[PDB]
């Protein structure tokens, strides 16, 4: 019921405390379901099955069945939340009385609060009220331990001053010891205390929602005991919490308006491997067109460059790493370099790889890089803790670093990427950190040739500004020429304009994550083995290719290329999800490796090799 006094004082009175606690118990037990299920029974069943420590309830259901509580909720949320903690504790103990050891506490979260305010507009009129809001996490410190029921050693006599509850507002302070009667220098008993997880995030208004002439505004937020690490930086998150002012934040200091900071005790944060995967992946792997389906599922937002779609497929699935003895580093990573004249989807390719492949990061030879190739240690600014920011490769240790504009990286990045793909370990020796972080990168890269146009007369090495050892070890070199042509340009223009009209704001092969599950399955679980290839055929293949390449200015095919051939064979076997490499796979790996080698070779020699080796490129 209602009276002249305020809502908060009302709900503070004991009579209505029992009233609303009874009402919460009542609808917890009785609000069966939309369609007669008693959903609270099943929710509590799962809650205690995992020991989640936290229930969540829908505000629409709350208000619809019992509306007085819903109206009271934003007015004096703290008191209602405490009582619902107690009532939920009662009902969960009723369902499972064995729960008593489990945390002695249940939190309750409220979802779908109808009235969302915007971080631009949170005024005095929302203090001490439960609001709903949206934003992006700009920072999120680590999980810290907070006092929740603290016991103090009176260090005059070592009496254990009993467990004081710790509100978020002001630090608890014992008056005196019940034994020796001193307000002594008390100090926390580290053990008998039962702490509580504390994490501090900072959300800000999303640029997609910020207005024209503006700076997005940022509100702090505190996560406690179950929601810590429920959201990482850059996550678009809805936040529901008690917008809050009265803790100790106030500019009572000199030189300041009497102006208060604010926080949000977050009461609900909402962001915005498997089984049967073997079944689906193997069932489609039966099809045996799966190689071309993968080749046509890789990079659908690009036209042409089928050679590079295939090549990046082989780079994505990789080979296998081996070490005969503890003496020979032979690698499973297939490194790729697109070299292309401008405006030919190099960065488009790279961003597709970043989107699709797990443990992918992006980096640029220029200084605009999100993540850097070098490794450095400093005090990271948004956290101000002294990190070892290990570079881009190490951060992409398993999967892919993607080096866009590979042809302009500063000489330090040249040194670092060379030493990465050569050693496969990045050797840091800056402050006192003389270590070697292993970097099993699978580098993809893009490079614009000299003069902004590919020059078929000169060779690849001398018309791209990447020095010989760097250009060598890349398992695939691909050339991208923007050759003017009627039908090609017609097709490209029609595709682009179709995308544009489709992407007007009025209109608002295998799927990509299907391919991603395929990627991890065939990258870790499946290791095709090789005793089933015409060893003599490939040995004579190297013989014939190098024998033709014997000439001046004709740096020949070598063992680098023959091991790259085996890597590509394994990769195609992986791609076929087989457990044994087959002559078909060996033929395809031969085809792609030889295509890469001839197109590396300049025009006249390219035509000689193409004419005399068309039998393999025929397949």
């Amino acid at each position: 019921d209602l009276k002249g006094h305020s809502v908060r004082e009302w709900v503070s009175m004991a009579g209505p405390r029992l009233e609303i606690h009874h009402r919460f118990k009542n609808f917890l037990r009785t609000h069966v379901d939309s369609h007669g299920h008693n959903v609270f029974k099943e929710r509590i069943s799962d809650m205690c099955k995992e020991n989640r420590e936290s229930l969540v309830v829908n505000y629409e259901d709350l208000a619809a069945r019992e509306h007085v509580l819903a109206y009271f909720l934003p007015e004096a949320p703290a008191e209602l939340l405490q009582i619902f903690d107690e009532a939920a504790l009662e009902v969960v103990l009723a369902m499972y009385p064995k729960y008593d050891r489990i945390t002695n506490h249940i939190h309750v979260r409220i979802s779908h609060l109808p009235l969302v305010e915007e971080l631009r507009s949170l005024r005095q009129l929302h203090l001490n009220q439960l609001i709903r809001t949206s934003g992006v996490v700009t920072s999120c410190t680590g999980v810290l331990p907070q006092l929740s029921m603290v016991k103090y050693n009176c260090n005059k006599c070592n009496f254990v001053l009993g467990p004081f509850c710790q509100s978020q507002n002001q630090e608890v302070k014992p008056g005196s010891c019940p034994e020796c009667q001193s307000a002594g220098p008390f100090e926390v008993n580290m053990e008998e205390t039962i702490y509580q997880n504390y994490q501090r995030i900072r959300i800000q208004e999303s640029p997609g929602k910020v207005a024209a002439g503006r700076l997005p505004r940022s509100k702090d937020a505190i996560l406690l005991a179950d929601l810590v690490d429920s959201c990482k930086p850059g996550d678009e998150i809805e936040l529901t919490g008690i917008y809050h002012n009265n803790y100790d934040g106030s500019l009572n200091t000199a030189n300041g308006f009497p102006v208060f900071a604010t926080v949000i005790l977050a009461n609900h944060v909402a962001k915005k491997l498997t089984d049967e995967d073997v079944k689906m992946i193997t069932s489609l792997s039966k099809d045996q067109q799966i190689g071309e389906k993968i080749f046509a599922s890789i990079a659908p937002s690009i036209y042409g460059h089928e050679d590079i779609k295939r090549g990046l497929a082989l780079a994505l699935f990789g080979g296998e790493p081996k070490n005969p003895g503890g003496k020979h580093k032979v690698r499973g990573d297939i490194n790729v370099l697109l070299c292309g004249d401008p405006g030919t989807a190099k960065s488009q390719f790279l961003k597709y790889i970043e989107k699709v492949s797990s443990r992918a990061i992006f980096t640029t030879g220029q200084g605009a890089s999100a993540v850097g190739l070098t490794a450095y240690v400093q005090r990271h600014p948004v956290s101000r803790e002294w990190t070892l920011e290990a570079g881009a490769l190490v951060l992409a240790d398993r999967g892919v670093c993607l080096i866009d504009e590979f042809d302009k990286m500063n000489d330090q990045d040249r040194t670092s990427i060379h030493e990465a793909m050569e050693q496969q370990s990045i050797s840091i020796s800056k402050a006192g950190i003389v270590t070697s972080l292993q970097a099993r990168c699978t580098v993809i890269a893009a490079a614009n040739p000299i003069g902004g146009r590919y020059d078929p007369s000169l060779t690849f090495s001398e018309n791209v500004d990447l020095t010989e050892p760097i250009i060598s070890r890349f398992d695939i070199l691909c050339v991208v020429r923007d050759t003017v042509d009627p039908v090609q340009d017609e097709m490209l223009a029609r595709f682009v304009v179709g995308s544009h009209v489709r992407h007007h704001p009025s209109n608002k092969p295998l799927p990509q994550e299907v391919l991603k599950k395929y990627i991890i399955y065939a990258k870790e679980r499946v290791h095709p083995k090789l005793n089933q290839m015409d060893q003599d055929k490939v040995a004579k293949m190297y013989s014939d290719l190098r024998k033709e390449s014997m000439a001046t200015g004709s740096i020949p095919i070598t063992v680098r290329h023959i091991e790259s051939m085996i890597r590509m064979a394994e990769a195609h076997a992986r791609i076929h999800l087989r457990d044994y490499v087959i002559e078909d796979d060996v033929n395809m790996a031969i085809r792609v490796m030889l295509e890469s080698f001839i197109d590396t070779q300049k025009f006249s020699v390219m035509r000689s090799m193409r004419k005399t080796f068309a039998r393999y490129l025929s397949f």
Binding site: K329, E422, T558
Partner: protein
């Protein structure tokens, strides 16, 4: 695990043990080590032999001429104006002393 290059394998063998340093009664010093230069082609396993020899030495560091990722080649020492200590960045040469 490399085909042939038998003279190079024996050369690496002699290299790994190295000579014997001479400090003379005057005081001068003569080296007790061996240097192996390996000019040549791409195709042969030059960097791979470098890789193994680094793995197989008791203490050994395999670097590029152009320093290393967040690691120089020669040592450097630099004053720190705040604390005045001469911090000593250790290169490959000194980080593999005796190596």
């Amino acid at each position: 695990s490399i085909f042939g290059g038998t003279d190079m394998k024996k050369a690496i063998a002699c290299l790994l043990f190295g000579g014997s340093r001479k400090r003379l009664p005057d005081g001068l010093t003569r080296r007790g080590d061996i240097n192996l230069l390996m000019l040549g082609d791409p195709g042969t396993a030059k960097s791979q032999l470098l890789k193994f020899v680094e793995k197989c030495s008791p203490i050994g560091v395999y670097t590029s001429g152009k320093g290393s990722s967040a690691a120089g080649l020669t040592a450097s020492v630099m004053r720190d104006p705040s604390s005045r200590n001469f911090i000593m960045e250790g290169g490959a040469m000194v980080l593999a002393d005796g190596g």
